[PDB]
Design a binder for these strands. Structure first.
Ligand code: GTP
Ligand code: GTP
Ligand code: CA
Ligand code: CA
Ligand code: CA
Ligand code: CA
Ligand code: MG
Ligand code: MG
Lengths: 897, 941
DNA sequence: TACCGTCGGA
RNA sequence: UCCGACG
DNA sequence: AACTACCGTCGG
RNA sequence: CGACG
């Protein structure tokens, strides 16, 4: 309680633009009758007054916190303050641009403030102040306004942000600015009318027509207003087709067959392409529209050019009138785009094996694939090392630097070589060095492969080229039969056969996470020309008793993606399983069903009652949301117990699958599940208080007895590790080495050159001896500071600074080339590198290459040039970074040779 | 004409006794030098003897160096064979990885008209690689020799009199075919000839029609009477042809048609695999029309097993398995498509009668080897051409509409291609990406193992643009780079206004195939792509539920473009990058397309709705009977043999008769060109491709393309008579106005081509070039003068340095003046020395400019490539200082390389990254990263 | 004054 | 442009 | 002390 | 880290 002054105080020193106030307050970095005064508001860069970029600042000052659909964000991080004298330390983050949302577009980003705060229901770090208290924290966040940068902030939403480092579990809480110093009673940022959270929520959800909803679920729908989305277009009432019924089963079971998905007209789809700047028209988008959320797919039957969209009951999360423009605006979160290979995750393996007709054969196949994959990998690197052009291509494919190059506009350099080992190899190879000839490169290439082996031991990867995660859609047009799916691609899906569609074959579909044996299903891919224009989506039938998506771990067509696999080896043994009869767990899982109406009865009728009920929902929902979550604990418990049983289909496996199936829906479903319910369910149905071990596959080595038997144990320890160990032993054998050597007669060329001049001139000899000596001093400082585990980059740079200081008559002017702004590009730099190489190449080779790699590459390129054999090119750092190896050149050139 | 016969006795270079020991590659390349340097190979004054070193040479320069020691050879050496070729000729038995070493010569008429002078001058070409063929694989590339020779029936004014005024044609033909020709130790006998078109005479020795003639080496000094290239067995041309054609079983064929099938043995192909007899299904009947017309519906195409397709992918290194290949297999020629019904794993192929061009037993393994000429591969956008436009207008439901559209399309296509280059020009990273996507240099880079240079810059203008931007030059700040981009665009505009190749995004040229499986109804076609076919608005992986136009070039009849319905059949989904026509109906759709079929024909396929939707199909034309003018010589091989009798001697004589008779037939003047041009002019002046004269001439040229294969005789008199009796007289029509570069007509253009070129293309091109010229910069760049400044300051305080600096200055103007004479002089534009040779001579003079510690420090003599020393930097800088405005082309072409070096040196900034000095080879293996260009620009904006 | 279209430069 | 195939 | 916190998809 | 299921 005495939680009475957590936020920074606002002084009357109170007329500053909101952006100016927050950035000035950001002083916190820490000064509390000094003559502080309001300097003369029109700044366009923060430096003029951990830094907000100017573009953000201009939009904050002049753009009303909005630009290109991006909103400036008032985000803050709160962490427990160490001192425990009679709580949190606020750290207002820099102003940043984040994608906007319905609520910020309708009321203004400046009126929204988001914080990351430690959960009060959490852990040793939690201060004793643990001895209380949660009600007091929740009251602090909800019951009252919060003053900050001259605005009164009220809380209206909370969501789990997960474990965060000050590690503890932190909540994201959202606040709305209801009033302020610049605010007006009953629009620019400064001239803002005062609006209560209760009205802001009533605008979004139209509570008067939704009091029948469980308030917990209603509260969860607030997330639609905060969904970060691209505003595409606004549609007119006569352009919106609200259906009053979903597509239902033809078998009369009553099941909804298009849960979450509707059609849009082809023109609407075109506007999406135009607004988002997309190479083609998207077949389907994940979006929001009024109360509706889910997927929209092009009506392949739309021949006109008129804009329209439909909604369905399964999509509309609350009764909406769709009157306000912002409730009629199509909002896209993502579009169905070109697919990539998915591989096979380990959760799928137990179910795949559980459903195999021949478990021994299915195991044998997965293992033979992995052995074939690892053997290919090891063999390809060995072949690549033989030729620089081939090794450059392999080194480029193993690690991606484009992100690092784009952010820097160049390959970043530490001292005389690029930061990364893979860039050091390519850079040095581009200058003519050979890994099989220059030991320095040989060693580097040895590290990377040795580190690559260590990455394989840690993580088991079964990669299947013929798999992909794909948005799921339902078949509005009735062309697909119950067990048929349609899959066409927007481009070539490449597997070392290639595909543009799937036709006349079986496929597996699943959703991750898969738990029940039926959470994977085998189906027949049939390409229907009627659907040819829908690409990068998989289309399920709308016939049959139950929608196929429902079978995929309770899936639907509202944004769900399916794992789709058409690898014939993985598919052919699979035997479908009926959906499981889920046990009754109500003894352990209590559902709070209280409706908004029931909440209101406590207060009466009319605006005053409704507003009270609304702030009630918020506080109660905050309590629920802050209750410790057990999804992860129970998921891990299931993994450990199913491992022990080697079963995913027996009685405890179904129980745990049903349990975790309800723990994901916890916020929307109002499911209560505390520590005591977990202890009771374990005691009565599982292994009681016993703490379960971790599966053996969770460590790098087989620490068990006898040969591994669990499929994941078998693949990681009986297939993968022995193969990896065989390559490592081959690599360890190195000892064997007509070999790679540090010495390169090319790199001493400048040294020998200047030695001949020095022998005939005393004046030049003195400069040479000085140079030789100063280099010696720096090599001793490298031994001192580099060979000292303050940080390693800093220490290398420290020597590099001393190295670059080694500086030098027509001879001096020709050596120094003063007109060059970058002294590392003059002839003295070459000479220094050559002389250092000559004197320290065998004693201390890393010093020479780390200090002078850059110039050694220059010397090498110069020396290996041959008259009339083409021209070496001197690339600028920027232009060098934008180039990549040409895969076709390597294959074509290698074939010729 | 025995005066011609006199000048036809010492045409080939003599093979001296001192070179008999030489391997053929030696004899060839040694002979080439003697011929190029004007030294007599039997000159006794030189004391010539075989150098034993030549037998082990791995570089031709090593052999020629020995000759250049002699004073007689000390003129620039002739173009040299690449080293891998030469080694292959010396130790590889003339074959490497499916490539054959080729022996070729070019002949031109001797300008000397002495009665005793050689009629022709010979230039042996350097050994080279070309793809092999069945005949070179079966008998060895070293036994084949091909020449280009002037056609003795040429009527050009340039023909000497000894032939033009004389029995000369009969004497030349007899020279070619009567007996063996001695050359490099071997006896060569002609066995095939084909038209090689109009060729300019070599400068070393007015276009003339030349023939390509192929000789087989029947024997030679090292040959053995009845393998390595040197130990070869005697073999007669008559026998080699019998091996190819199995003449005993083909005497029923017209001998001229039989002769034309020799091309199948010479077709350049990749040998894939050899199938066993039991894997080969010879069909006795083609797929026939279901309506009983007898018409063949799969003319030239058959099925292969899925495993055969896989082997093709493997052997050729393809990304995926190709649905269809163009190939040869024994006597069969045509297309083979994967059997979509094949689920086994057994190798097999099938042949049809329409594919088999002679009766072949398929016993020999070389007659059982699938050979691939080409595969159906990823498609690209096509465009219109001058032949389609009049037919598209003829068939248009609204001529005025289509006319106005085609034009407005040309206009918008020009605007997008100018607007994309103008945006890209604003940032160097973006222009580089645009230049890289503009052209393809991968092929050249892979062959030379680097970017080839001419003097101080890459040869390509595209490579030069990127090479100089890679060193930091901006194309909006340096005029030399702007000028290069300008010239490049002009050239493309010139091509548009000359060829009117209007781009149509939704169009492609696609191999045609027939539907073996009966799923396509008549007038339905199936098109699936192997990957996304992009068009700015829409992208495609297949075509479904739309109308398409299909056509073949040459298109002449109104019905040579056909509008049909694209229907995607899931049964055929695995056949990609081909267009499949129906095998139902009375006539195969392929036949309607200028008489086409499925043996390698490609169709122009258009699915652009604005172009498709106005088109109205025409019915097939009522063709005239032209037998009065086109006379087919149908003489069979059997009939030829009756002149001689039966048995092996008779057959051998008949075979050589076929050859000589077919040479005479092949050397007769061809009228395809004249009659096609006549049709163009007539249809132009009438502005009609559908009236009676248009149909007659379309039917005529339709017959003359088939000429050599059909035995059609059509002489000058018959052309005249044909024009007289059917076409209103033997006239000489005006050239269309669009043949000229500016509008020479009166008033507004009337013909659609005139309209598009002169009303649309020309004004728009001048408009774009006006706005492109306004969206763009100086020659000067202070950075490039940094070294020049640096050294004036030194040489302002040193007399010795100043003397050096002045000699450099003076000698640069010396070479500059030489550049203005050899390259700049418009007079030198035509000279025996071509542009590259003239540049190099100036470059050599430039590189000859050459510099005590200051000299050592400038020279860096330990560097093997003096062009990388600091001197080369000072030289380029000074030259730039002096001539950046007066002679920009000179500075950049001589010193561009070092200028690039100085620029990258000067623009480097401390701690702002490191410039990278790439090796020439490593530089050529890199390509722009499109994903980097887009990611970086987005961060910038 | 004697053709056009598709590919490729081993 | 030149050279080499092909339709 | 010692129990004990999930999978997948895209982007950055 | 940032969204999303
Ligand atoms: N305009 C023009 N068209 C040509 C030329 N050469 C071939 N063609 C085209 O090719 C056609 C003949 O095609 P081919 O497949 O080579 O021969 P074919 O008529 O099918 O006869 P076969 O070889 O027995 O199958 C005709 C023309 O349409 C040419 O030089 N000029
Ligand atoms: N393992 C795991 N699955 C999640 C998590 N969050 C969402 N899911 C998956 O998403 C499912 C919830 O689907 P949603 O699309 O978000 O909502 P819904 O269940 O369809 O309910 P509505 O919003 O009313 O349509 C459940 C899970 O299968 C998570 O944190 N962990
Ligand atoms: Ca869902
Ligand atoms: Ca749902
Ligand atoms: Ca043909
Ligand atoms: Ca044919
Ligand atoms: Mg659901
Ligand atoms: Mg034909």
């Amino acid at each position: 309680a005495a939680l009475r002054n957590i936020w920074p105080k606002f002084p009357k020193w109170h007329e500053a633009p909101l952006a100016v106030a927050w950035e000035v307050t950001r002083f916190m970095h820490k000064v509390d009758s000094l003559g502080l005064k309001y300097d003369p508001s029109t700044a366009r860069d923060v430096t003029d007054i951990e830094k907000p970029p100017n573009d953000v600042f201009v939009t904050a000052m002049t753009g009303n916190f909005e630009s290109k659909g991006s909103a400036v964000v008032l985000s803050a991080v709160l962490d427990y303050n160490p001192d425990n004298s009679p709580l949190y330390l606020v750290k207002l983050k820099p102003l940043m641009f984040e994608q906007g949302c319905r609520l910020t577009r309708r009321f203004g980003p400046d009126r929204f403030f988001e914080i990351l705060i430690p959960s009060p229901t959490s852990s040793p770090s939690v201060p004793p102040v643990s001895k209380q208290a949660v009600e007091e924290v929740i009251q602090w966040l909800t019951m009252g306004q919060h003053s900050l940068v001259g605005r009164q902030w009220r809380a209206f939403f909370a969501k789990d942000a997960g474990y965060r480092k000050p590690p503890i579990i932190k909540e994201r809480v959202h606040f709305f600015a209801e009033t302020g110093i610049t605010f007006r009673p009953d629009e620019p940022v400064e001239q803002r009318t005062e609006f209560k959270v209760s009205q802001m929520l009533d605008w979004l959800l139209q509570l008067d027509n939704n009091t029948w909803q469980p308030h917990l679920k209603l509260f969860s729908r607030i997330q639609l207003g905060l969904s970060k989305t691209y505003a595409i277009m606004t549609l007119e009432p006569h352009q919106i087709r609200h259906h009053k019924t979903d597509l239902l089963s033809p078998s009369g079971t009553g099941e909804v067959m298009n849960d979450g998905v509707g059609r849009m007209s082809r023109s609407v789809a075109k506007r999406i392409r135009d607004v988002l700047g997309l190479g083609d028209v998207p077949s389907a988008v994940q979006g929001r529209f009024g109360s509706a959320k889910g997927m929209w797919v092009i009506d392949v039957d739309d021949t006109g050019d008129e804009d329209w969209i439909e909604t369905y009951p399964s999509q509309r999360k609350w009764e909406c009138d769709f009157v306000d423009k912002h409730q009629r605006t199509l909002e896209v979160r993502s579009v169905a785009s070109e697919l990539k290979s998915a591989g096979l995750n380990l959760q799928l393996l137990p179910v795949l094996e559980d459903r195999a007709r021949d478990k021994v054969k299915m195991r044998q196949a997965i293992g033979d694939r992995l052995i074939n994959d690892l053997q290919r990998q090891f063999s390809e690197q060995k072949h690549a090392l033989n030729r620089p052009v081939e090794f450059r291509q392999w080194v480029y494919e193993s690690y991606s630097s484009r992100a690092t190059r784009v952010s820097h506009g160049r390959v970043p350099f530490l001292a005389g070589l690029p930061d990364s080992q893979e860039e050091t190899l390519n850079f040095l190879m581009n200058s003519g060095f050979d890994p099989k000839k220059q030991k320095y490169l040989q060693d580097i290439a040895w590290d990377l492969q040795k580190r690559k082996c260590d990455t394989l031991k840690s993580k088991l990867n079964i990669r299947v080229g013929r798999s992909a995660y794909i948005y799921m859609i339902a078949d509005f047009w009735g062309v697909l039969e119950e067990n048929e799916v349609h899959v066409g691609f927007s481009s070539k899906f490449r597997d070392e056969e290639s595909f543009t569609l799937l036709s006349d074959c079986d496929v597996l579909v699943a959703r991750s996470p898969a738990h029940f044996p039926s959470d994977i299903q085998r189906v027949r891919a049939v390409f229907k020309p009627e659907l040819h224009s829908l690409k990068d989506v998989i289309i399920f039938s709308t016939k049959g008793d139950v929608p196929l998506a429902k079978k995929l771990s309770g899936g639907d067509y509202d944004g769900d993606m399916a794992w789709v696999c058409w690898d014939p080896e993985i598919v052919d043994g699979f035997v479908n399983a009926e959906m499981p009869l889920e046990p009754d767990l109500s003894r352990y899982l209590k559902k709070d069903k209280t409706t908004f109406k029931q909440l209101m009865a406590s207060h009466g009728t009319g605006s005053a009652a409704k507003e009270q009920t609304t702030y009630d929902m918020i506080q109660k929902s905050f309590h629920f949301a802050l209750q410790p979550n057990f999804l992860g604990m129970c998921t891990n418990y299931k993994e450990r117990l199913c491992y022990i049983n080697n079963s995913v289909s027996n009685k405890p496996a179904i129980i745990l699958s049903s349990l975790v199936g309800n723990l994901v829906d916890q916020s929307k479903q109002g499911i209560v599940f505390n520590e005591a319910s977990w202890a009771q369910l374990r005691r009565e149905l599982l292994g009681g208080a016993l703490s379960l071990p971790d599966p053996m596959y969770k460590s790098d080595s087989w620490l068990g007895r006898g040969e591994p038997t669990h499929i994941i144990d078998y693949l990681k320890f009986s297939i993968a590790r022995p193969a990896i160990d065989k390559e490592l032993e081959a690599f360890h054998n190195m000892k064997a080495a007509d070999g790679a050597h540090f010495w390169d007669p090319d790199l001493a060329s400048y040294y020998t050159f200047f030695k001949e001049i020095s022998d005939k001139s005393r004046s030049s000899a003195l400069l040479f001896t000085t140079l030789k000596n100063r280099i010696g001093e720096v090599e001793k400082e490298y031994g001192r500071l580099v060979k000292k585990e303050d940080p390693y980059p800093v220490r290398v740079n420290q020597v590099y600074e001393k190295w670059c200081a080694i500086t030098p008559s027509k001879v001096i002017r020709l050596l120094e080339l003063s007109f060059l702004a970058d002294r590392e590009m003059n002839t003295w730099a070459l000479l220094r590198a050559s002389t250092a190489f000559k004197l320290y190449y065998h004693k201390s080779p890393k010093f020479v290459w780390q200090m002078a790699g850059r110039q050694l590459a220059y010397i090498k390129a110069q020396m290996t040039s041959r008259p009339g054999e083409g021209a070496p090119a001197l690339m600028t750092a920027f232009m060098y970074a934008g180039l990549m190896p040409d895969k076709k050149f390597t294959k074509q050139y290698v074939a010729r040779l």
